[PDB]
Design a protein around this ligand. Structure first.
Ligand SMILES: CCCCCCCCCCCCCCCCCC(=O)OC[C@H](COP(=O)([O-])OCC(O)COP(=O)([O-])OC[C@@H](COC(=O)CCCCCCCCCCCCCCCCC)OC(=O)CCCCCCCCCCCCCCCCC)OC(=O)CCCCCCCCCCCCCCCCC
Ligand SMILES: CCCCCCCCCCCCCCCCCC(=O)OC[C@H](COP(=O)([O-])OCC(O)COP(=O)([O-])OC[C@@H](COC(=O)CCCCCCCCCCCCCCCCC)OC(=O)CCCCCCCCCCCCCCCCC)OC(=O)CCCCCCCCCCCCCCCCC
Ligand SMILES: CCCCCCCCCCCCCCCCCC(=O)OC[C@H](COP(=O)([O-])OC[C@H](O)COP(=O)([O-])OC[C@H](COC(=O)CCCCCCCCCCCCCCCCC)OC(=O)CCCCCCCCCCCCCCCCC)OC(=O)CCCCCCCCCCCCCCCCC
Ligand SMILES: CCCCCCCCCCCCCCCCCC(=O)OC[C@H](COP(=O)([O-])OCC[N+](C)(C)C)OC(=O)CCCCCCCCCCCCCCCCC
Ligand SMILES: CCCCCCCCCCCCCCCCCC(=O)OC[C@H](COP(=O)([O-])OCC[N+](C)(C)C)OC(=O)CCCCCCCCCCCCCCCCC
Ligand SMILES: CCCCCCCCCCCCCCCCCC(=O)OC[C@H](COP(=O)(O)OCCN)OC(=O)CCCCCCCCCCCCCCCCC
Ligand SMILES: CCCCCCCCCCCCCCCCCC(=O)OC[C@H](COP(=O)(O)OCCN)OC(=O)CCCCCCCCCCCCCCCCC
Ligand SMILES: CCCCCCCCCCCCCCCCCC(=O)OC[C@H](COP(=O)(O)OCCN)OC(=O)CCCCCCCCCCCCCCCCC
Ligand SMILES: C=C(C)[C@H]1Cc2c(ccc3c2O[C@H]2COc4cc(OC)c(OC)cc4[C@@H]2C3=O)O1
Lengths: 171, 347, 167, 105, 110, 80, 120, 98
């Protein structure tokens, strides 16, 4: 067949969000609140193109907007966030429910210094709409032309010409 | 056996055949065969004697081995196709294993070695069920996979079944073994025309079921399981000898009887496809089963026999046995050849 | 050597069947089938079928081979056996030598000789085992399957009580 | 015979477990969902005789997704040439294929 | 991986203790015994009822095997169908028990 | 209707409790008002990603953000 | 053979287009033979239970003849329908493929040379 | 293809040849039959888990349940033979040769 095209290693260099999973899980509700638009443009491009090579730049925007999400935490509320993700980080299942007062301190300092409202129960699971400028893929599966169907039956049904025509049976 | 439980078990036999007939998923095909086997095992053990336990154990082992080979065929189909539709198979190894497994369920040669034994060990009504109703489901699966059936395998199994069913019944005095070798020969006749025209396969299946049902119903009506007890029928009921006469002449394929209808059409559908030698030697072998039928009705049905004095007691009592559908089945098993183009309703 | 562990279990699985299909007795045949069920269960567990592996342990070994050993106890109180055993073992080890010296073999199908760690998937499934939710789908999507299986088991109870009576 | 009771009565007895492209619990795709979808949409309605010859490329792509014989054959060729150049000494593994580079994300 | 370590450790400790138990008093040279049971040498008669309770276990264990994915099946979105099929399966287990009851299959080990 | 019931409650109270609990388990989800909320909670549980829609221009009922007032809500679950 | 035809509307004994075909008359010789099979069935039914064959159960022989004619009428309708479908598919296939059925040129016997084989 | 599939099929064929031509205890034949079922379970499980085809995960349980019910049925036949001859030797099952 053909050669599969791959992007170069410079096309894959972006500054990584090099924080732990409890750090990501601690700020995840405010992350889904504040980093909505580039994340949803990326996941729309990712379910529509069905190809990650066509989804690099939007992904870079994700990694552009996540870092600016954490810098904006690090400039303002580094200590209550640190006290919060440490308590998230203790738990083996990483329970939100074991960590409600540290969550309250982090949410208080974030609403005071950044004005961010934490999403409620049922908001980040909504199907939202995304206004992009990229065109709709007319053939995301790269499917070739389908075979033409067999001709259907038409014409009025006539009797059998002289019956069964089986050796001597005249009907 | 409790008649309610008997009704439930017969409905489960019918339900398993229906699940094999209607289902689109191979697992449900396998489930229908499992249900059919599990339900038919008490019908064979109705009288509770050691011959029925031997017959049911042999039937269990053959149908269980066939069911495991069927599931292995389905599983190789899943390897090489990633799906489960009951349609053509996507590997010749699955094709061979499923043809072998259905040949074991039908009793075709070289897996014929249970059909004369099991039919001998079980009563006449359960042998009727075995030789008629238990043929419907594997012929349905063979009807749906015929784009994948290897021609050389199905013709080897078919002509081997026809030769072994021909040369196995020459030696037989037991009526149930005569019907069982006749079963093996007729399944060869059904499966040899399968890849050419499956409508004639269905025609042979229905005419065979009618003639076999007629023969077992006459056997239950006379309570005769051997040739010699069949010879003692004319002094009790003379019409029953006439009916076993005309129905055994029909099962071998005499014109102008109805059992000449399928196989003639089968020859008629094998010379279209430029096969001349194969239906020729196939009907040469059918002449041998017709020939021992003509010995088994000339020597031992027509010319009247020495009787016993206790038969003169049995003159004073009529048959109270429910001969269900017996005149209809006897007319249909003999006098249906002028309606030979009825076969188009099976298309 | 640890990368081929599924393969290694499969070899034991083959060996286990030649362990009991040689058939010294139904006692030791049952013992070989129980060891074979354990190692094939290890094969199943190493692909992520944890519920199906515990169905091998709970239902096949813990449910059914118990009844085989029970009936072997109550109802059933060399050269051919050992010869068939060593014959099948020589066949299987020559197959292992072929597929390890060639990394390709054809008995019936064409088979690769590398380990089956390559043929997996690189994704995740979130907060569920896909195999667990597919078995949970028996009650939501598998209605007709539940109907025919429950009717077969009810008929199975009725059929066992019929043929074990002898009357 | 295939008495199609399921289509005549309009009931879904066992069409759901039939293919991998059907509706799965929690929208789980199979690994060869796209290939099986392409082959099913190719072979639909044209009959099996025309499907065996006119949808060969989709079916080969789908069977090779299922079994990965070509992919394992190519990996065998690359790993075997790599083992030959390691035994001869004309090649050395890089630090990102020896495990000395502290992976990306 | 750690599971196989644990299983192997338990099998190793059991085999160690069983071998020490079978072979620490075999160091002793106690005495050689000739020693020349309720039944003497009669063959074990088959008990039909024991086989019937074993098969009844096997069939109800299969019905249990069908019942086993119910805590996961309670998480479905088709709860009416799921609840119906769950009640149907436990009812069919109860019907198999009722047929085992009324046909005197549960007698003398009731 | 009460003589046979008192008779079976005096002879077989195990089976009376069995058939009564079984009858309640059959008929009571058709009478409970909370059976709707079981369905509602099991469809409100987001196992998958809420895959976004391309804004065609006219989808007023679809939000543009999780915190927008339109869309499905779970206040019925936060209150209960 | 024709199993892809009656797979779009399965399990129809008589489809709707079968009503465009002429139904058999009640004096159809096929249907009269089926009624004679019913009369033979009534005679065999009186023969196997030792009744007077031509005399007993005239209502029963009447229901035998009636029931066989009743079943055979619809069987003959389906028969005629399936041969009509066979010819319809044949003719529409010949019309949709003119290249496969060429109008071969009709030569009269004045151009056709046949070898004479004398009987002597 | 996959290499573990060859071993599972070879196990199936070993137990299939163990079922077919030995003429031994009947229980040994039932053991070979359930070894065939075991290898079918393992092979169906590895395929369905390999392809991530979720709806067929309930398929091997079905393959277990029916066949184990089948196994129960076979044991009862054996017990009837064990109530007739005192042994499960299949050469006692030769009444129906004539
Ligand atoms: C379509 C396929 C139909 C296939 C046959 C269906 C019926 C038979 C199967 C079930 C069965 O055994 O029923 C008993 C069965 C009698 O079978 P039997 O015991 O062998 O008969 C011996 C004596 O007749 C026993 O006599 P009796 O003393 O008990 O009383 C007389 C009895 C009393 O009758 C009644 O009581 C009937 C009235 C009440 C009916 C129920 C109402 C509720 O009358 C009859 O039995 C008269 C003969 C009935 C016709 C039998 C054959 C039917 C046609 C078969 C198909 C032929 C196709 C030819 C194709 C050729 C071309 C290929 O049938 C009936 O009693 C009624 C038959 C009704 C036929 C309806 C046809 C139209 C269907 C649409
Ligand atoms: C009609 C044909 C089928 C009739 C079957 C039943 C015959 C019967 O019972 O006869 C006795 C009966 C007179 O006897 P009965 O005094 O009442 O009492 C009888 C004694 O109890 C009898 O005394 P026994 O039993 O105490 O002792 C004598 C002994 C003597 O027994 C012996 O000696 C043993 C047998 C000797 C060797 C075999 C001789 C030949 C018999 C088989 C036929 C083979 C050739 C057939 C063609 C080749 C195929 C093999 O047994 C008999 O004679 C038994 C009685 C029955 C004899 C006839 C049986 C014929 C059935 C076979 C032919 C039909 C089916 C196959 C056809 C194949 C294709 C054509 O005769 C008739 O009923 C004949 C029919 C007469 C009226 C015809 C009216 C025609 C009306 C046409 C219009 C109506 C239809 C309208 C249709 C359209 C409506 C819309
Ligand atoms: C305005 C509206 C109302 C108008 C009303 C007008 C009518 C008023 C009168 C009502 C009654 C109508 C009767 C039916 C129509 C005429 C049927 C007819 O003559 O067909 C000629 C038919 C062919 O002649 P054709 O010159 O081409 O057609 C003249 C007409 O246009 C015939 O029409 P076609 O050209 O369309 O013929 C169609 C085709 C013409 O046939 C063919 O193209 C050739 C295929 C025929 C079948 C060959 C099978 C050979 C192997 C089996 C042999 C079995 C053994 C022989 C019989 C043994 C005893 C059963 O038929 C078939 O293929 C069907 C099969 C044959 C059925 C014949 C009718 C039977 C009814 C009575 C049954 C009693 C037994 C009869 C003989 C059974 C054997 C056939 O003759 C035969 O096939 C030979 C058999 C004799 C004919 C049956 C005569 C019916 C009346 C019999 C009364 C005596 C009964 C004595 C007691 C029972 C016997 C022991
Ligand atoms: C006794 C029978 C009891 C169960 C009857 C069906 C119950 C039911 O609601 O099934 C719905 C289910 C499923 O329907 P559903 O309404 O859940 O459909 C929603 C679609 N899915 C499943 C994808 C979420 O089954 C059917 O509708 C068809 C299959 C079974 C039909 C009944 C067969 C009875 C056989 C008796 C012998
Ligand atoms: C798991 C924790 C508990 C483990 C078990 C308990 C721990 C101690 C185990 C060792 C105890 C000593 C050996 C077993 C007991 C011996 C009793 C006996 O009759 O000995 C006489 C026996 C035999 O002595 P004998 O020669 O007089 O034999 C008498 C029999 N006639 C005369 C007929 C020959 O002594 C031995 O067998 C010696 C064995 C080794 C003794 C210990 C060596 C050092 C161990 C450290
Ligand atoms: C494309 C395929 C689609 C499907 C097509 C239809 C296929 C039909 C296949 C028919 C198979 C019938 C098998 C036998 C009937 C089933 C039930 C049964 O066994 O009834 C017999 C019954 C047993 O009663 P019991 O008390 O046990 O008898 C012992 C004697 N003391 O009672 C007796 O023993 C009484 C004695 C007479 C019994 C005669 C039964 C005849 C049944 C067959 C009729 C003809 C076939 C139908 C028409 C053709 C269809 C192809
Ligand atoms: C519809 C609801 C759901 C029903 C299905 C689910 C049931 C769950 C429980 C499963 C039980 C399985 C086995 C049941 C067998 C029942 C038959 C039975 O046991 O009859 C025999 C018994 C007499 O006992 P015996 O035969 O001697 O046995 C030895 C003990 N002495 O005779 C009896 O014990 C008489 C039994 C009948 C009377 C019981 C009445 C109970 C009423 C409770 C309140 C109403 C509940 C609503 C449902 C109606 C139930 C009848
Ligand atoms: C006696 C006749 C009783 C007929 C009852 C109704 C049967 C019916 O309608 O069957 C439908 C079937 C056509 O359905 P179809 O899916 O096209 O069949 C493919 C078969 N291989 O039609 C048929 O199968 C018609 C032929 C039935 C003949 C049965 C007796 C011989
Ligand atoms: C014993 C069995 C199985 C058969 C063979 C047999 C009979 C009964 C009668 C006869 C018969 O052998 C035949 C041999 O050759 C012909 C050829 C004939 O015509 C070609 C012919 O016409 C009536 C008659 C005959 C013999 C004849 O009467 O039953």
């Amino acid at each position: 067949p053909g050669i599969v095209e791959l992007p170069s290693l410079e096309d894959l260099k972006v500054q990584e969000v090099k924080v732990s999973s409890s750090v990501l899980k601690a700020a995840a509700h405010h992350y889904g609140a504040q980093c909505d638009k580039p994340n949803k443009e990326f996941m729309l491009c990712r379910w529509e193109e069905k190809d990650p090579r066509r989804c690099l730049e939007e992904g870079k925007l994700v990694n552009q907007c996540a870092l600016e999400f954490f810098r904006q935490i690090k400039r303002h509320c580094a200590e209550p966030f640190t006290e919060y993700w440490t308590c998230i980080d203790y738990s083996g299942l990483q329970l939100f429910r074991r960590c409600r007062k540290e969550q309250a301190q982090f949410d208080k300092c974030v609403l005071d210094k950044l004005g961010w409202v934490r999403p409620d129960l049922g908001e980040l699971s909504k199907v939202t709409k995304v206004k992009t400028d990229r065109p709709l893929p007319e053939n995301p599966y790269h499917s070739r032309a389908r075979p033409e169907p067999n001709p259907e039956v038409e014409g009025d049904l006539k009797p059998a010409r002289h019956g069964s025509r089986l050796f001597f049976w005249t009907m | 056996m409790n008649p309610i439980i008997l009704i439930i078990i017969l409905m489960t036999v019918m339900l398993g055949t229906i699940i094999v007939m209607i289902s689109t998923h191979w697992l449900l095909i396998w489930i229908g065969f499992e249900m059919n086997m599990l339900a038919i095992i008490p019908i064979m053990m109705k009288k509770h004697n050691p011959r029925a336990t031997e017959a049911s154990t042999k039937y269990f082992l053959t149908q269980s081995t066939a069911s495991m080979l069927l599931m292995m065929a389905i599983i190789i189909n899943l390897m090489f196709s990633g799906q489960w539709t009951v349609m053509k198979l996507f590997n010749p190894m699955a094709s061979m294993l499923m043809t072998m497994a259905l040949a074991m369920k039908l009793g075709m040669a070289p897996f014929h070695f249970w059909v004369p034994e099991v039919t001998q060990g079980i009563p006449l009504s359960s042998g009727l069920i075995l030789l008629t109703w238990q043929k419907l489901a594997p012929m349905s699966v063979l009807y749906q996979i015929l784009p994948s059936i290897n021609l050389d395998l199905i013709l080897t199994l078919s002509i081997l079944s026809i030769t072994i069913g021909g040369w196995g019944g020459l030696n037989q005095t037991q009526l149930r073994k005569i019907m069982a070798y006749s079963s093996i020969a007729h399944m060869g006749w059904m499966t040899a025309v399968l890849l050419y025209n499956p409508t004639m396969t269905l025609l042979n299946l229905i005419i065979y079921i009618i003639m076999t049902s007629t023969m077992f119903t006459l056997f239950m009506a006379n309570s005769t399981t051997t040739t010699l007890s069949l010879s003692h029928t004319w002094n009790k009921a003379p019409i029953m000898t006439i009916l076993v006469l005309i129905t055994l002449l029909s099962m071998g394929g005499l014109p102008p009887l109805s059992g000449f209808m399928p196989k003639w059409m089968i020859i008629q559908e094998m010379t279209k496809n430029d096969s001349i030698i194969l239906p020729t030697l196939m009907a040469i072998t059918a002449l041998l089963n017709l020939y021992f039928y003509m010995r088994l009705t000339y020597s031992t049905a027509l010319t009247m026999f020495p009787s016993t004095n206790n038969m003169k007691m049995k003159w004073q009592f009529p048959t109270t046995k429910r001969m269900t559908l017996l005149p209809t089945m006897t007319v249909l098993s003999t006098m249906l050849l002028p309606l030979t183009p009825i076969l188009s309703i099976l298309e | 050597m640890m990368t081929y562990i599924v393969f290694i279990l499969s070899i034991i699985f083959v060996m286990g069947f030649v362990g009991f299909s040689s058939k010294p007795s139904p006692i030791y045949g049952g013992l070989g089938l129980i060891v074979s069920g354990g190692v094939g269960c290890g094969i199943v567990l190493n692909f992520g079928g944890s519920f199906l592996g515990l169905m091998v342990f709970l239902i096949y070994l813990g449910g059914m081979m118990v009844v085989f050993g029970y009936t072997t106890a109550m109802a059933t109180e060399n050269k051919v056996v050992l010869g068939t055993f060593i014959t099948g073992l020589l066949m299987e080890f020559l197959m292992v030598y072929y597929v390890l010296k060639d990394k390709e073999v054809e008995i019936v199908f064409k088979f690769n000789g590398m380990g089956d760690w390559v043929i997996y998937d690189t994704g995740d499934s979130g907060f569920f085992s896909e195999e667990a939710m597919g078995i949970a789908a028996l009650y939501s999507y598998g209605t007709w399957l539940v109907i025919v299986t429950g009717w077969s088991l009810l008929i199975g109870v009725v059929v066992i009580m019929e043929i074990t009576r002898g009357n | 015979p295939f008495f199609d009771v399921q289509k005549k009565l309009g009931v879904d007895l066992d069409h759901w477990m039939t293919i991998q492209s059907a509706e799965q619990p929690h929208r789980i795709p199979a690994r060869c969902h796209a290939f099986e979808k392409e082959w099913i949409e190719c072979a639909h309605g044209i009959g099996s005789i025309r499907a065996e010859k006119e949808c060969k490329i989709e079916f080969e792509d789908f069977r090779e997704c299922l079994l990965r014989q070509k992919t394992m054959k190519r990996l065998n060729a690359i790993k075997r040439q790599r083992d030959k150049l390691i035994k001869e000494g004309k090649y050395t593994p890089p630090p990102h294929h020896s495990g000395q580079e502290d992976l990306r994300p | 991986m750690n599971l196989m370590i644990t299983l192997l450790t338990n099998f190793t400790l059991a085999t160690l203790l069983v071998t020490i138990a079978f072979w620490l008093p075999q160091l002793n040279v106690y005495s050689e015994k000739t020693s020349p049971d309720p039944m003497g040498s009669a063959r074990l008669p088959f008990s039909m009822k024991f086989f019937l309770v074993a098969i009844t276990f096997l069939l109800f264990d299969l019905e249990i095997a069908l019942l086993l994915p119910l805590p996961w099946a309670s998480q479905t979105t088709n709860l009416n169908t799921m609840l119906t099929m769950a009640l149907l399966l436990i009812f069919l287990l109860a019907v198999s028990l009722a047929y085992e009851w009324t046909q005197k299959g549960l007698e003398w080990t009731e | 209707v009460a003589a046979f019931l008192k008779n079976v409650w005096a002879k077989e109270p195990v089976l009376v409790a069995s058939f009564a609990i079984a009858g309640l388990a059959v008929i009571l989800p058709t009478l409970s008002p909370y059976t709707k909320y079981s369905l509602m909670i099991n469809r409100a549980t987001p196992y998958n990603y809420p895959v976004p829609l391309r804004d065609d221009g006219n989808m007023p009922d679809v939000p543009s953000h999780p915190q927008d007032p339109q869309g499905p809500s779970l206040e019925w679950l936060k209150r209960l | 053979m024709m199993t892809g035809r009656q797979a779009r509307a399965p399990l129809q004994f008589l489809p709707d287009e079968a009503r465009s075909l002429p139904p058999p008359k009640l004096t159809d010789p096929r249907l009269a033979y089926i009624g004679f099979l019913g009369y033979c069935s009534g005679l065999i039914d009186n023969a196997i239970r030792r009744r007077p064959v031509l005399s007993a159960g005239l209502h029963r022989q009447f229901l035998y003849i009636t029931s066989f004619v009743f079943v055979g009428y619809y069987l003959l309708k389906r028969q005629d329908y399936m041969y009509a479908v066979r010819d319809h598919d044949m003719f529409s296939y010949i019309k949709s493929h003119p290249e496969d059925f060429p109008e071969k040129d009709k030569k009269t016997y004045r151009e056709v040379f046949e070898e004479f084989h004398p009987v002597r | 293809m996959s290499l573990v599939y060859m071993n599972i099929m070879m196990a199936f064929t070993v137990s299939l040849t163990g079922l077919l031509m030995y003429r031994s205890h009947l229980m040994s034949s039932l053991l070979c039959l359930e070894g065939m079922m075991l290898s079918l379970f393992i092979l169906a499980t590895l395929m369905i888990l390999n392809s991530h085809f979720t709806l067929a995960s309930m398929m091997p349980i079905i393959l277990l349940v029916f066949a184990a019910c089948e196994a129960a049925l076979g044991l009862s036949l054996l017990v009837m033979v064990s109530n007739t001859y005192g042994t499960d030797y299949v050469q006692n099952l030769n009444l129906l040769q004539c």
